[model samples]
Target: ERVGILGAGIGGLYSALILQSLDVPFEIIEASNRVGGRLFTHKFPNGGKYDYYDVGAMRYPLPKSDDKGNYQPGVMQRVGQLFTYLGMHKQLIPYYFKSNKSPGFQYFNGVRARIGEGSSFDAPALGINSSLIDIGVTKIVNDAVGPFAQALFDDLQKHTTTGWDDMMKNDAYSTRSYFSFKYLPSPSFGLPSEHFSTRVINWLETFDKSTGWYDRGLTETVLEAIAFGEVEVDWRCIDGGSHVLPDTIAAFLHKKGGNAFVMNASVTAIGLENPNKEDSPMVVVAGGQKRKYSHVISTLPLPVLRTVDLKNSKLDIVQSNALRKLQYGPSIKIGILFKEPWWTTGQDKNGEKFDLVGGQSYTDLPIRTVVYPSYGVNTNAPSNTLIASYCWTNDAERMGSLIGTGAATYEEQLEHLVLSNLAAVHNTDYQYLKDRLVDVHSWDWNHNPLTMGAFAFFGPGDFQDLYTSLNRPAANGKLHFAGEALSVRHAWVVGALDSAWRAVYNYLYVTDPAKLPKFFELWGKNAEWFE
Candidate 1:
C-alpha cells in the first residue's frame, strides 16, 4: 500500500527513508520548494564560503550518562544511530558552546563580566539579592534542577512508570511557580522556593533564558534538564551545513527509484474520504490535486495543521484542543556577515583578545543571545559570520515585532539595534562593528506562514493532557501525526526524528499489524519518549 508523507522536513524525510528501506512505497509532499524546512542555513551573498549560520536546529547532542556509560534510550542514541545508518557520521564536527575567547561577556544592568567558571557580579549587583548573587547563576540553576533530574533517573532505574508519574505531579506548575514556591513534597532537592528570592528568580529568568521562558510548564523545564543536562552533553553540527541532513535524505529518495518528492505542493486540505470507516483511504489535497492513500503521515506543525480542513478528519476533542491550543513559542535569528573576524582578533576594554571562537554571549539587550560560529575557525581566512540575535519567547516577540513590519527602514533599524546591543555587550564601538558588516538576514519563525510558530513550549498541563492523545492515530486510524511539536523532546532535531519513528509505527500498527515484529531491527530505537 502506498503511504503519503506530509511535509519534507526531517520527520517526513525520515519516515520516507524508513519506508524506502522496507520497500514500502511513499511520497513526500512539501509545501516549500526546498527539503530542509527548519534546518535552514542562511549564507551571505557574495561572502566567503562557510560565511553563514544555521537558522534552525544547528546542533546535535552526544550526551554521556553520569557514570560515562549507557543510561537511557534518547535523542543522542537515535541521532547517532541514524547518522551511522546513513553513513554521514563523519560529516559532523564538534560544536563548542563554550569559548576560550575571554569566556564571552555577560552584560546586565550596564555591567560587563566574563561568563566563566569564575563568574563575577557587578558592584551594583544588577538588582539581584546580595546573598544569592554570590552563588552564581549557573550553579543556582544546576542546584535547583539537578535534584529533580537525579530523582527522575533514580525512579526510572527503579520503574519507568514511577519516574514519569513523579514528574507528572509537577505538570501543574510553571517553572516560575516552582522557583518562587519555597516548600513542597519530595524533600531536599533543596527546595527552590526555599532558595530563590523573587529577585533571584527574576534575575535567573532574565539572564538564563529568554524573557518569560520560565513561565512555560515546569514539566518542559525539568524535561529539558534531563534531556540536555544528562551527565555531560557534547554538541555537533554537520560539516557543510545543517541542511545537509534533510537535503541528503531528499536527494536519496529522489534517486532511490522514480521521483517520490512533490515540492512546492502545499497540503491545503486533509480529511477522510469516508469519515467513519476503519480502513478508509485518507484524502490529501495538495495544491490543486486531490489524492487518496492507504495512510497519510502529517508532519505539519499544529498551527499550520489547524488551517487544513480537519473537520472531517475525525480528531477527538483533546487532539482538536491540542491543534488549536498548543502554545508555540516565538523565536528570531539574525545572521550577519562581517568583513573581518574582528570578534576573534579585537581586544576588549581589558586589552584581552575577544577570541570568542565558538560560544554564545548572554545579555539583557534585545539581542538576548549572540552565537559566534564554531566552524571556520583557526584558519588564515576565518568565516566572519555571526548570529547577532537569537532570542525566544517574549524577547523574540519584541524583536520579531521590529522584524516583520516590512518597512525599508525596519531592517536597518534592526541592524542598528543589534549593532548598539553588540557594542554595549562587548564594550566596543558601534561604528567600528558597523563598518565591518557586509550583509544580513533575519527570520522570525512566528511570522512564517508555512510554520506558524517557532517550536512547542507546552503550557501547564499541555503535555499531561494532550501529549499522548496528540500522538494517537486520527481520521479513523488512517491519519498519523509527527513533528517536533508532538515529541517529548520538543523543539530539537531528535524530537522530529523520534516523532517520525512513532508516526511510521502508528501507520504500520493500523494497516499491517503483522509487520511490527522487526520494527526495531529496521528503524532503530524509537527512544520510548512517550509515557
Candidate 2:
C-alpha cells in the first residue's frame, strides 16, 4: 500500500527517511514553500549563508558523550544519531544557554538588576526573588511531586503495560496550581500575585519553550526537570541555520527517485474511501484536488489537523475529543540584524560598560527574552543577528495584539517596541541602538496557517485522556500519527524524530512482521530510552 505523509516537518521528514530505508513507497505534502517546518531560518536579504538567524528551533539539546565518544542512552540520542548519520556533526556549534554562561539582566516591574549579581530573590522589588527563583521552584516541586514523576518513569521502564493506567490517572495536577499553593506561602519570596505570577510564567516559558505554566500538567514539568538533571548542559546550534538539516534530508530523499517529496501542497481534508474495509485507502484533499493512498501518516499539528474535515476519516469520538483538547502553545520570534554586535564589543561609544555574549536577558516588558547569538563569535562578521524579542504564551499573544492586523504597520510598530526594550536592557538610549539596525525578520507561529501555534502540550489531566489517545492510530492502522506532540519530550526536534521512529515501528507491527527491521539495525538499540 502506498503511504502519504501530510507534513514535511522533522516528524514527516524522518518518517519518510525510515520508510525509504525500509523500501516503503510514500509521498510527502508540505503546506509551506520549503522542507523544514518549524526548523525555520530567516536569511538576511542579499547576505551570505553565515548571515542568518533561526526563527524557530534554534538549538539542539545534546546528550553527553563518553571517553569512547559514545553518547549516553537518553531521549536526545536519536538527534545525536541522526546528526551523525546525516554527516552534520562538524556543523554543530555549542550554544551557551542562559544562567550557565553568564549572568544576564532581569527587569521586573520597574526595578532592574543583574541576575546572580546583586539581585535578591526576596527583594520585595519584584514579586519574586531573582537569585533563588529556579531553585525555590525546583526544590518545592521536587519535595512534593518529583517522586511521583520518577516512580512513573520507573514503572514504565519495569512494566510498560501494567503500570500505565494508574500512573496516567494520578498525574492530574496542573503546574500553576502546584506552584501557587506551595510557592506563594513564603513572604520571603516577596512577590505580589501579579509580579509572582509574571516571574513564574516567564520561568516556565523559558524552561518549557512555550506558555501556560498554570494550565499545563505539572507531571510533565517534573518529568522534564528529572530528565534535565540526568542530562548535561551541552546544547548545539547549526552553523548557517537550523534548516540545513531538513533541506539536506529532503535532497537525499529526492535522490531516492520515487516522487517522494513535495512542497506547497496543503492538505485540506483527510477521509477514508471505505471505512468498513480493512484495506480501504485513505483519501487526502489539497488545493481542490484529492488523492487516495493505502495509508496516511499525519504530521500536522493539532490545530491545523482539527480544521481538516474528518467526517469519513473513521476517527471516533474519543480521538476527536483528544484532538480538540490537546493544546498548542503560542510563540513568536523577532530576528533583528544590526550593523555591529554591540553586545559582543562589551563597550558602548563612550566606553561605558554593558556586556552580553551568549545568554538571554529576561524582562517583564512585551519582549519576554532578548537572546544573543551563540555562533560566529569573535570572527568579526560584518553584520550580526540578535533575537530581539522571543515571546511565548500570553506574552506572545500580547505582542501580537499590539500589531493591529497590518504587516508593514505591524513591523514598524514592533520595531519601536523591540528597540525600546533593547535599550532598556542594555541601559542605552533607544535611538542609539535603533540607528544601528540593518534589517529585521519576525515570525509569529501562532498566526501561521500551517502551524496555528508553536507546539503541543498537555493541560491538567490531558496527558492521560487527550495525549495518550491522540498518540494512537485509527481506521485499522491505515491511518497513523507522528509529531513532537505525540512524544514524551514535546516541543523539540528530538521529540518529532522520536515520534517518527515509533510511528514507523507501529506501522511495521500492524502491517508485517517480516518488514520490521531489527531495532539495532535502524537506530542503534543502545541508543533506546523508554521515555
Candidate 3:
C-alpha cells in the first residue's frame, strides 16, 4: 500500500522521510517547483555569496544541555536532533539575539536615541509618561505575565494536567484585553490593583515587534515567552541561507533513489473512494488526474487547504468550523543589498561608527525592525545586506500595499520608505543610504498563495477547542494533517517538524499498529515531546 503526501514543505518532507525510514513507500507532491514552502532564499542578480536573505524563518534557538550532556525537553530538542542528524555543525553560525554595546538606534516619537542591551531612554522626550520611566517595557511584561509562564513551566515539570486546564480559564481574553483589564493587579508596579493603560499597550505595540500584535491571544504571548524568553538560549543560523534546510532534505531523499518527489502537482481535491466505508482508499485529484492511495496526509496551510474540495470527508461541524475560522497573521520583510556594508562604516552625529555586527535595530517608523546578518560580521567575507523593513500584523498590511511578488522592481513609495526609515534608524542621510543600494527584494506572506499569511496564531478563546480539533484526523482516519499551525509552538520551523512527527505517529497508529513499535523506537521513545 502506498501513502500520498501533499505540500513539499518542511511538514510534508519530514513526514515522507519518517515513513521512508520505516521502508514505507510514499509520493510527495509539491504544487510549485519550489521545494521549501516558506523557506525561500531570494537570490538577487549580482549578489554576493551571503547577499541573499531568508524569505521565511531565519533564526533558530539551540536547546541548552547540562554539564553531563543532558538535554531539555522541548521543540528545541527536536531541532537539535534533526540538525545533528543532518551534519550541520559546520554550516551553523552563532546568531545574536542582542548583546551589550549593540550598535543600533531606537527612534520613536520623532526622537532618536542610541540603543543597546542595557541602555536607558528619555521617556519624556519620547512622549512617554516620565513617572513610569523606572518601569521599563521588558519589566512591565515580566511583572504582568511572568508568573503565568512560570506556572506553565512548573506544571510541565510536575506533569500536572490541571495546571494547563487552569491556564485555559483566562484564554477568553486577548493580549490587549488582558493587559487592559483593570481587575488584574500588579505586584511590582504598585499596591493598587491596576492593569496597563491603553497608551502603555500602544507603547508596547510601537516599541515591540509590530502594530496590533497584542491583539492576539495572551496564551500565545505566554507561549512566545516560553519558547524564546524562558531560558538563556544559544541561537544559530545556516551560513548560506535558511533554505539550506529544505534543500538538504530534498538532496537526502534523492540519494535514496526513488520517484517519491513529484513537483508542480497541485492537489485539487481529496475524498474517500467510498464515503460510507471506513477502510476505503482515499482519492486525491490533481490536474484531471485522480489517484487512490491507502492513506493521505495534507501539510498545506489552512487558507490554501480551504480552497480544496473536501466534501467527501463529511467532516463534523467542529472540524469544519475549525478549518474555516482559523486565523493567520500577516507579515512582511524587505531585504536590500548594499554596495558595501554601509551600516558598519557609517558614523552617527557623535562620529562613532555604526559597526552594527549581528544584533538588530528597531524604530516606530512603518519599517519597524532592521536586522543585521549574523554571518560575515567583522570578517572580510564581502557580504553587505540589510533587512530594511520587517513588520507584522497591521504594519505588514500597510507596508505590504507596496510589495510585489519577485517582479524585480519595487514601488517608488516602497523605496522611499525603506531609505528614509532605514537612514533615520542609523542616523544617516537618505542619499548616503540610497547610493549604496545594489538591489532590494521582499516577501509578504499575505501575497504568497502558498502560505496566504505569515503563520497560524490564536486569538482570544481560539486557542483551545480549535487547536485540538485541527489535530484530530477526519474522514474515518483516512486523512491526516500536519504543519506549524497544528503544533503548540506555532510560527517556528521546529513546530512544523513537531507536528510532522505527530502526524506520522497518528498515521502509523491507525494504519498498522504492528509497525508502531519500530516508529516509537526510532522517534517517540523517551522523546519528551511525545506527551
Top candidate by lDDT: 1
As for TM-score, the candidate ahead, 2 or 3, is 3
Looking at model 3, which ten-residue stretch has the lowest summed lDDT? 522-531
TM-score of each: 0.93, 0.88, 0.93
Candidate number with the higher TM-score (1 or 3): 3
The residue-by-residue lDDT of candidate 3 on 1-531, one tens digit each, is 788888888888888878888888888888898788887788677877878788788888866644433446654777766766676656777787663244567777667766744334445655666545566677677766787788776665666656567668888877788878833646656544666578767776666547877888888888777778462566888888888888898888888843378788788898898988867898988756787888888899988878899989767788888877778899999999998877766676558688767778888889998888776674666468888888888989998988994443556668888999988877778888888887878788998888889998778777776778877888888788788888767788878887888888888888787888898776664223323
CA lDDT, every prediction?
Answer: 0.79, 0.72, 0.77
Residue pair clashes in candidate 3: none
lDDT of 2 by residue, 262-308 (tens): 66778888988888876688889976678888888889988788898
**Model 2 quality (TM-score):** 0.88
The total of clashing pairs for model 2 equals 4
Highest TM-score among the candidates is held by which one? 3
Q: Could you tell me which residue pairs clash in candidate 2? A: 121-129, 121-130, 127-191, 176-214
Score candidate 2 by lDDT: 0.72
> Candidate 1, residues 258-283: lDDT per residue as tens digits?
33888899999998888867667888
